[PDB]
Amino acid sequence: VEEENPVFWNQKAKEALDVAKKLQPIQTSAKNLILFLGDGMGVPTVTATRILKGQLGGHLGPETPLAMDHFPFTALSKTYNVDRQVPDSAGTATAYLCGVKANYKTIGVSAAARFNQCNSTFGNEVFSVMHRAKKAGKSVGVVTTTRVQHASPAGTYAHTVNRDWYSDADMPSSALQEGCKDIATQLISNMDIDVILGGGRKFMFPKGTPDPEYPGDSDQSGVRLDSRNLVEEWLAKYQGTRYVWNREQLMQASQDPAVTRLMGLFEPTEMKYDVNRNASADPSLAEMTEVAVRLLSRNPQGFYLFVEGGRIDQGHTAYLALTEAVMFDSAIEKASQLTNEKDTLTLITADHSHVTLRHGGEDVAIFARGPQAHLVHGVQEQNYIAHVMAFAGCLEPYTDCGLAPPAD
Amino acid sequence: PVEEENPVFWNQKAKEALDVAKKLQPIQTSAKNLILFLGDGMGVPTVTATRILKGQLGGHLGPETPLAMDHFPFTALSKTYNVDRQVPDSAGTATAYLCGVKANYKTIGVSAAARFNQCNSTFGNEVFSVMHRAKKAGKSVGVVTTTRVQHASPAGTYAHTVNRDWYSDADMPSSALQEGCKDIATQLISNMDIDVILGGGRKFMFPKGTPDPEYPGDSDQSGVRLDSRNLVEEWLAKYQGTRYVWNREQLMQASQDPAVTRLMGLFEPTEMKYDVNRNASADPSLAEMTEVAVRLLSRNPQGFYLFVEGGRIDQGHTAYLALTEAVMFDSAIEKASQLTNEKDTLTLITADHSHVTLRHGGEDVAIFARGPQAHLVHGVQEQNYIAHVMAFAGCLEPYTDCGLAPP
Ligand SMILES: [Mg+2]
Ligand SMILES: [Mg+2]
Ligand SMILES: [Mg+2]
Ligand SMILES: [Mg+2]
């Protein structure tokens, strides 16, 4: 009935005009960089999530704002790969994580490399913003609901001509002989990663190693054929490392002063849909985000954090897809509470689009808040995301940013 | 493309985009001129497919080639829902982006207190468009469309009706006529002074049986009015300096005539032909109509308000008709960019609602903006925000006390 009065709509517009007038750009560099990636979360998925979140909280739906709807800056992102108008998660990851567009099914390599051709990797590797943040002395983290070896998180640390090479068991012998390394091996050896949280236990352990939560199921066991225990090798890199596999272990590790580096692998492969998770054994995406922020924020140089709501497209009955998107929105709100807008650049995007009474390759929305977030505007190529983040953090190739540091 | 295999190519392209974003400064004055370009059903997927087609037409691969709209500095997402429907129609949305209030499905220029097809619910529930308030402030006003001028989107600038289908008196029940309700065609000539009216819809303006000037042998194309009114002759008699045109040759001559100060061009009995099927000598393109409207409207020292609709984009959606209409719509935006200065002109590009390989409904749409106060177009907004940004930038009611410096 309030909606039948023109005064209600005029007041709602006057409120929106007041937020726009108060909006000022933050002209400093960013100390912290956060990228939230919604897998297959294009414009239609964002709309359906807003409706569902609204309805869950006792509202009609479309009028209720999500945590992302409060981000001041918006842009459209062109997602095409160099060789395909309709892209995949691997090719897009190279663009938003490394700053160069690439070929379909390849990770952290330029479009000079060729899918499934192992020799084409060498001399064609491209380095992520996360890699450059580590080089500048920042702490780095990767948080995902998929396996940590999946295309999107793998974009922060790996270089591969084939996204399906999760472990040595997935690779042809010709590729191994040519010097190619599986994604699980690259996770522990390419660079120092301070925080790794998600799924993918089975790719880290020798063939037959029983899973700690599913010891009676052979399908959940270790798969490696090189007798390597990648978790034990990552733990031995430095003092202060900790490996966790359940929520109870995760919670204690987050408050432990001796823990400076953390690896949490919560399932043999993908983490369960939030709707089906065991609340005592399995941490939510919001819980993993809070733990990563608490651990990464101790570094006075700052941090780079990648957060993926990775099962949104995988679920897309729609109910699974939308409840993952709602949990993804609550992980954004959680990070907004633990960080200050004056020193933290937060970006929200999708890698690619998903393919009544009150078919792929489409552009996706980019949302931004914090220092240099006003550079996120108009219609941009997807690789622009990595460059705005490098520029705001004064990371290579933008050490010459010319930006004033933030306060504190 | 071999250049695309080099990381240097992508790094240089992003360094260039960074320089443009850093140089981008807000224009802090009011706007003298206001232009709204509306793409019928031109959501995010349609914009992407149009970019590919326009690119390919000009000899490129497609997705890398910018559209005229891709050069707009400011972007926002628009929530399109009607008060009573999550999936909206063109009538309800028009009230939001043209009047600034969200309304009910199938109604035009009335608040959600009015009820569909209930004539008595109109009175006291009328809402006034930004176009109407621009005219009240002394600006010149224009409506350019590829649909009939009585269609839901253009009708949103001048009409108040509880039923979008009341194009002429022949469409209305006798009970609604007796209650004081007026058809859309009648409201076009009587509600307000409109300086420029270009599009289709000849048949709704003439008495029953009046042969169409272009299709005199087709009874389906003849006048339909039952009140014996010739609405074109009435509109022409309102002021001195008026001109009525029905083909391209007459439009071009009217455009070059200094004695023409007001213009009505009705190019088809109903909707204008798809640009791809038009007779280049008899039918003007959307870009041609836009140039004529801008040239005529820009003479007023107080400024102007112009509404431009690429109205057949969703109607065509084989896809080829839809996409070629969207390409012509992009060229009308480029044409207006050449004839106006961004220092005194606020231009907005949007859609009313969304449309329902080798190199549903109710979804949010993109809003693109350039000019004074265009930086207020940001984030995720309700669709009615478009009308308020435009009223604020132009210092029109209810923002006469805008507090903005003149351009
Ligand atoms: Mg993913
Ligand atoms: Mg578990
Ligand atoms: Mg329309
Ligand atoms: Mg004609």
Swiss-Prot record, chain B:
CDD domains: ALP. Transmembrane segments: none annotated. SMART domains: alkPPc. Zn(2+) 1 binds at D40, S90, D352, H353. Its cofactor is Mg(2+); Zn(2+); Ca(2+). Disulfide bonds join C119-C181, C395-C402. It is a lipid-anchor; GPI-anchor. Binds 1 Mg(2+) ion. GO terms for biological process: cellular response to BMP stimulus; dephosphorylation. It is an enzyme of class 3 (hydrolase). Glycans are attached at N120, N279. It is found in: Cell membrane. It catalyses: a phosphate monoester + H2O = an alcohol + phosphate. The active site is at S90 (phosphoserine intermediate). Zn(2+) 2 binds at D314, H360. GO terms for molecular function: alkaline phosphatase activity; magnesium ion binding; protease binding; protein homodimerization activity; zinc ion binding. Gene3D superfamilies: Alkaline Phosphatase, subunit A. It holds the Pfam family Alk_phosphatase. In most mammals there are four different isozymes: placental (ALPP), germ cell (ALPG), intestinal (ALPI) and tissue non-specific (liver/bone/kidney) (ALPL/TNAP). Rat has two genes for the intestinal isozyme. Belongs to the alkaline phosphatase family. This is Intestinal-type alkaline phosphatase 1. It comes from Rattus norvegicus. The lineage of its organism: Eukaryota, Metazoa, Chordata, Craniata, Vertebrata. The gene is Alpi.
